[model samples]
Target: SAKLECPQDWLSHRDKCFHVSQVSNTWEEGLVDCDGKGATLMLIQDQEELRFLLDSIKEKYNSFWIGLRYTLPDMNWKWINGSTLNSDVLKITGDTENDSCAAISGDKVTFESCNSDNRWICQKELYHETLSNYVGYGH
Candidate 1:
């Protein structure tokens, strides 16, 4: 049989597709749920991706956790994967205080208590038909 495809509601980017839940949950719980679905929390890498996510979630009122945090001192804001902030493209919105995690509620981005409950977007890398088709394959 052919490999099962992801649901239609999910948004497809380069090599990954994203899905934002309709219901809200805690940050940790959201992460767990994403993992259960074979994905991690959504990671925004550029303005286009940010626009896509914001557009996809335009109707939602509640915030959704992203794969970013302000845990480290010098590196206050960083992607969960340990990448430095991409100030030119994506950035945390408003005064975040000392909150470690970031979230999106419609077009606005903000920091919130990591433990606070919220919905989340999940992202799973799509399997390429061939190794040459992957991003940076020739680099």
Candidate 2:
């Protein structure tokens, strides 16, 4: 993992960095918290990535919020970054009384109250950070 080039306070998993926020906050506030660290929601790419994060984080209520949300009534849950979700990667409940925000709890991707306060996970691609340093590539 040494060559992964992750930022401080973040871990290198599969060549990417995962930042688990130290404090908990409302769903909306959580995004801002992550932005301060130059990351977006932890976009679980596949079963493997999901497994990596789930193992690294487990809270009483699965307090770590993910980037998926039920923004529209008819739309499938989508990542905040426009990346398509892989249903086979994780499991989630049918619904939470219209509370569409997502989280990882008990090894499952579950729904939670967006207004409710909780912790969250943030993810980023190392190559997305600096281009000039690597001339679009890193050492």
Candidate 3:
């Protein structure tokens, strides 16, 4: 498979990509930035992706919010795009008192204070062809 090329200065991985910015902003602002750049907040689909992201940001702190969050009483967790969260693979940690959004810290989910300012990571979806090319192959 081709490896994906992240936008200039973006962090690229085998099957995932992310961009780090010091601009502390709310989830909405972060999402807007990602969208403006043709991407979206990080949406982790598996353990491998999680590991890659954690490792990619090992040097950073101040927990970065992801695209995942809790919808309501019925739809416990889900992606910002409305996709149901796969609890089997991705798990959330910390008190669910009022916080529902998810963030990555070391390798697991952590509750983030929405109003708290911190650096954020935005993810972009890459076409299968692009992914394959990044891996030096064609699917």
Clashing pairs in 1: 25-118
lDDT of each: 0.71, 0.70, 0.68
lDDT of 2 by residue, 29-108 (tens): 78777777777777777788877776677554556787877656645677777665676666764343476788776677
Off by over 4 Å in 1: 1-5, 90-97, 127-139
Residue-level lDDT of model 1, residues 9-128, one tens digit each, is 778766667888877887778878888877777777777777878778867577888777766455456765566655565457433456568777777676678888788888765653
Q: RMSD in angstroms, candidate 2? A: 5.6
**Per-residue lDDT over 1-139 for candidate 3, one digit per residue giving the tens place of the 0 to 100 score:** 3556767666777655787665678776787888898888887777777777766776555577788776656546777666666667655732365655666655566656565665677887764343333545546
- How far does residue 133 in candidate 1 sit from its true spot (Å)? 18
lDDT for model 1? 0.71
Ranking by TM-score: 2, 3, 1
TM-score of each: 0.75, 0.77, 0.75
Predicted structure 1, TM vs. truth: 0.75
Candidate 3 lDDT at 109 equals 64
Residue 94 shift from truth in candidate 3, angstroms = 9.8
